[PDB]
Amino acid sequence: XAXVXAXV
Amino acid sequence: XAXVXAXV
DNA sequence: ACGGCGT
DNA sequence: ACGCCGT
Numbered sequence: 001x002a003x004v005x006a007x008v
Numbered sequence: 009x010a011x012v013x014a015x016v
Numbered sequence: 017a018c019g020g021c022g023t
Numbered sequence: 024a025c026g027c028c029g030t
């Protein structure tokens with residue numbers, strides 16, 4: 001759920 | 009995650 | 017269920 | 024010269 005590199 | 013030049 | 021960078 | 028995540 002976090003998007004810091006993927007944003008799932 | 010660090011932004012020293014890119015800031016991802 | 018997910019992965020990324022440039023000055 | 025630089026490292027981080029939650030629904």
Ligand SMILES: *C(=O)c1cnc2ccccc2n1
Pocket residue numbers: 001002008017018029030
């Ligand atoms: C988002 O909150 C989140 C939390 N845990 C994960 C585990 C694996 C893939 C993606 C995830 N996203």
Ligand SMILES: *C(=O)c1cnc2ccccc2n1
Pocket residue numbers: 004005006019020027028
């Ligand atoms: C994004 O691509 C990504 C990859 N690895 C991580 C590890 C810990 C927190 C955030 C991250 N983001």
Ligand SMILES: *C(=O)c1cnc2ccccc2n1
Pocket residue numbers: 009010016020021026027
């Ligand atoms: C941020 O903490 C971070 C860590 N590792 C990376 C590797 C590749 C591109 C971006 C990154 N960001």
Ligand SMILES: *C(=O)c1cnc2ccccc2n1
Pocket residue numbers: 012013014022023024025
């Ligand atoms: C920013 O553009 C950038 C490029 N290369 C690096 C290498 C090591 C630490 C920080 C960096 N920042």
Ligand SMILES: [Mn+2]
Pocket residue numbers: 019
């Ligand atoms: Mn990964």
Ligand SMILES: [Mn+2]
Pocket residue numbers: 022
């Ligand atoms: Mn580079």
Ligand SMILES: [Mn+2]
Pocket residue numbers: 029
């Ligand atoms: Mn977590």
